[PDB]
Write a protein that binds this ligand. Structure first.
Ligand SMILES: *[C@@H]1O[C@H](CO)[C@@H](O[C@@H]2O[C@H](CO)[C@@H](O)[C@H](O)[C@H]2NC(C)=O)[C@H](O)[C@H]1NC(C)=O
Ligand SMILES: *[C@@H]1O[C@H](CO)[C@@H](O)[C@H](O)[C@H]1NC(C)=O
Ligand SMILES: *[C@@H]1O[C@H](CO)[C@@H](O)[C@H](O)[C@H]1NC(C)=O
Ligand SMILES: *[C@@H]1O[C@H](CO)[C@@H](O)[C@H](O)[C@H]1NC(C)=O
Ligand SMILES: *[C@@H]1O[C@H](CO)[C@@H](O)[C@H](O)[C@H]1NC(C)=O
Ligand SMILES: [Cl-]
Ligand SMILES: [Cl-]
Lengths: 532, 532
């Protein structure tokens, strides 16, 4: 039977699913770990114990316990990112989409969801792997991992809550793919890990961590990189936030054991209710429980690792969206609203800068303000709004990714860089938000090929081109079809620094993505803040 | 007799001089002070003792002792700025050009020469007052003042070398105009002081100093302002440089008296030979002996004076040239030559920045570099050359002048701002130097009306327009002809900040002259250097 697969962990039964007039197999909600529940809360995951009988893999699994966005109830723009399944601490599952007929040894793509390490779901409509698996003849896996304090509470020195366990969940899922994907007709020697935002940071974290490098072949990073300022904290900061969480829940704070024990008695939602209280600053684009630079998962600082070449050397494909910062300003910056054009006053700009660069002294804040203010026109509400948008996306996504691409490319074996600047014609978010953080995903997953979703012809065409770039990259380490009349996506080189735009127009090659702004963020501002 | 005038100091006999097919009277080399020689070297000037008989004022006076530019022997571009008369410490004289027939009570314009306080001459071909006096029916005076250590050696506390005596020379000449110009047919209640560079700084210094305010009505500043970073030093720095001069000349350094006595024994040229050795840094656009913030001539710091409105409140007309910095890079920056296009390498740019901002720590230098580097094209030799040109002119001339205009306009009674961006068609300096520091002077003095000098028709027209702007400003406090069909030079206001271009095209009004760069130089960089 096509829907029956015998893995090393036991047999699984899938389901035949329709996709664009054909069908493929789906194996949804396969367990890869023991449920991280009870005394296991905050612990390293354990391998799932093999089961007798047949695992029903016909339906999506629970989503991990997480903060739920209620900022716009019934709005599809925000709700499409929320858990669409029951939340449970029992959430360590993966989903596999397999072409029909079952292949023998096909390219494998493993999706890691974003969500700022505090949210995310593998089961989202926009993460449905059927279009990609079917169109490009890949075995498509989506994994899952603990988020929030559940995945990232970090008390370094303690073995009950060491930190990073969400990353270890991801690694356990990659391990299980490596070990079992062959039975689903995937080639475990040609696995691409790909992810957006926290999932992109995650991808680069597996590239860095010695314990993960051997479990995949190549990597794709969308709108995130391991060195993002929001993606990790020191072991002291992680400890400080863990204790603060404890303080919020009236815990005994005398010892790690007393603290962890107390936090283990609480219901998931009690943790979630106070999670945002532990942030050290008034900030946007900062999340409470994130990866911790521990000396185990990451042996030394991310920067010394990137500088020394202490990471997996392979091919990478990565890039960013035009307007990375708009979501975060909509949600926390004064003067931004969903149903207005959000023209930003001088005062609100100033407040925005403070929220955007929370670790900055006044001199630092003045440097940012000057760098992004048109002083011929400093009261232009559109310029202030767009300047803030750029500040947030440059600082949090684009310039760290550009620092990563530049460090990586010196030691790696091939880099492809994109700039995604097409705004979906059917976006429900306002125009001021532009090409929004996360709105390339639907194109990567092939949603524009579904007529009932109302994209344009040109959007379907763009989607098919991106799916084919991603899948050919995963197959060969090169997004370009060898021997093909199509415009070619050039390698990114240390010297020439080329990238392409990804949009509905004919391909254009550019050099030095946002170089002016990224010299500021990666070289000048850090030196300023260190010296003052 | 038209050429005979009885002043309060004695009678003077002038000479009839040809000018553009007509004639006017010139009274050249009238003494306004006792010769500052011998034991008077470095001292406050003394009023000239009245003379019996008739002073022969038919010929130009000696020029003050000064460094002489030999950087390009026989080149007219540089030699036209050098003393064209014998140098002597006996150099405190003024020149008056008087329309014919002698007027009764006409507008007076008094020219103060620039030259970085270390050089300058009232007798230069380009400072010839006949064209302006004749064309615009003004009485035109050029004064003179001690330069170099002779005018500016400063040992605060000492009465033999207090500092600022060059400024006091200027003031004594303004005093003598105030007292005697009526006999030449000038109105001492309508005297405009005007000057370029050090002469412009000088003009603004008289606007600030309580001891000078009452001696003139209004003021014009060309390419210089009192707050320029090169135009004054602290009393400690002046003292330090005075002692260093003494060290260079093997002087007894035990006391001010011993030092001053030693310096008074030396020949002028001995002082001049070591003058450049006292600068604290490797620098361009820094001069050794300059005005000193003494608490007498300037009662408090220039900045508190500008902020409190502690200055003469009247009308001012002022502005700058497009390429203020090129002269100083030609002469001291590595990679610049007179007979090449001076395309500047990355390394030479970096060296240039260091020479240009000598008081800067490394962070400071990085801030400047970033602000003026196109990082898409950082090896563009033209961009590096022009960037350096802008750095030097912005830091030394334009942004300090813009800080002055903005502070002044809050308390003053009317401001007119220009941006002179026409390159003379007959310039002998290379093209890369653009609209050079000091090359609006020939237009202000009306040299383009002299056919034998080979300007264009349009240049003569521009010159006539500028002469008429300057003279109408001096006459009325407004460069515009009331009731006239000509395009109008708008007032500069705190709010709108308007200025005009001065060139051969039809007049264009702009706002916020070099605002982006001047926020950097006037607000951000000073705060950076103070905090680090
Ligand atoms: C320059 O100063 C004069 C006064 O010294 C100003 O003219 C006065 O303006 C106020 C308000 O418009 C009136 O009440 C007076 O009648 C005016 N006085 C005279 C003598 O006209 C003038 O506003 C100032 N100009 C600028 C540009 O500041
Ligand atoms: C698996 O689960 C689905 C939904 O709960 C159910 O319809 C199906 O019959 C189950 N068992 C199988 C396929 O053996
Ligand atoms: C697509 O278009 C239809 C028909 O015009 C519209 O009713 C519907 O809301 C759209 N469907 C979506 C956004 O899923
Ligand atoms: C004044 O000086 C000039 C030049 O030295 C001379 O020709 C003239 O005769 C002198 N005396 C006069 C005008 O009485
Ligand atoms: C002006 O033009 C003439 C004739 O063409 C030329 O010989 C002379 O050098 C120029 N005169 C100057 C620059 O004074
Ligand atoms: Cl479908
Ligand atoms: Cl003539």
């Amino acid at each position: 039977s096509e829907l029956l697969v015998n893995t090393k962990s036991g047999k699984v039964m899938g389901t035949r699913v329709p996709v664009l007039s054909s069908h493929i197999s789906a194996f949804l909600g396969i367990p890869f770990a023991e449920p991280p529940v009870g005394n296991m809360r905050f612990r390293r995951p354990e391998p799932k114990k093999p089961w007798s009988g047949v695992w029903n893999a016909s339906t999506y699994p629970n989503n991990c316990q997480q903060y739920v966005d209620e900022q716009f109830p019934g709005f599809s723009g925000s709700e499409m990112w929320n858990p669409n399944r029951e939340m449970s601490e029992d959430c360590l599952y993966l989903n596999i989409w397999v072409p029909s007929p079952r292949p023998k040894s096909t390219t494998v793509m493993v999706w890691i969801y974003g969500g700022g390490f505090y949210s995310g779901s593998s089961t989202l409509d926009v993460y449905n792997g059927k279009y990609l698996a079917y169109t490009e003849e890949v075995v498509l896996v989506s994994l899952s991992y603990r988020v929030g304090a559940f995945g990232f509470l970090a008390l370094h020195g303690s073995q009950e809550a060491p930190g990073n366990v969400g990353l270890l969940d991801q690694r356990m899922a990659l391990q299980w793919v490596h070990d079992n994907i062959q039975f689903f007709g995937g080639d475990p020697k040609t696995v691409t890990i790909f992810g957006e935002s926290a999932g992109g940071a995650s991808v680069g974290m597996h590239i860095l961590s010695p314990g993960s490098r051997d479990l995949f072949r190549r990597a794709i990073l969308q709108s995130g990189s391991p060195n993002c300022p929001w993606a990790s904290v020191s072991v002291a900061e992680g400890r400080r936030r863990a204790v603060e969480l404890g303080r919020n829940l009236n815990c005994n704070l005398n010892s790690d054991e007393e603290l962890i024990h107390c936090l283990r008695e609480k219901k998931p939602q009690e943790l979630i209710d106070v999670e945002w209280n532990v942030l050290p600053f008034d900030s946007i684009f900062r999340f409470s429980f994130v990866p911790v630079i521990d000396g185990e998962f990451f042996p030394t600082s991310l920067e010394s690792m990137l500088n020394s070449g202490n990471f997996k050397k392979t091919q990478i494909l990565l890039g960013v969206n035009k307007d990375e910062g708009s979501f975060f300003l909509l949600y926390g910056a004064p003067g931004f609203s969903k149903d207005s054009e959000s023209k930003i006053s001088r005062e609100d700009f100033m407040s925005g800068v403070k929220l955007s660069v929370p670790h900055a002294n006044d001199l630092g804040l003045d440097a940012v303000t000057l760098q992004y203010t048109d002083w011929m026109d400093d009261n232009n509400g559109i310029k202030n709004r767009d300047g803030l948008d750029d500040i947030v996306g440059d600082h949090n996504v684009i310039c760290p990714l550009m620092h990563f691409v530049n460090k990586y490319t010196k030691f790696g074996n091939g880099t492809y860089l994109y700039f995604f600047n097409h705004r979906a014609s059917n976006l429900v978010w306002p125009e001021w938000m532009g090409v929004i953080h996360g709105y390339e995903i639907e194109f990567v997953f092939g949603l524009p090929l579904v007529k009932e979703l109302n994209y344009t012809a040109e959007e379907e065409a763009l989607s098919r081109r991106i799916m084919h770039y991603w899948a050919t990259f995963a197959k060969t380490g090169n997004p370009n079809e060898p021997h093909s009349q199509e415009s070619k996506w050039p390698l990114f080189t240390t010297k020439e620094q080329k990238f392409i735009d990804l949009n509905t127009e004919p391909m254009k090659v550019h050099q030095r993505l946002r170089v002016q702004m990224c010299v500021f963020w990666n070289q000048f501002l850090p030196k300023l803040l260190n010296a003052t």
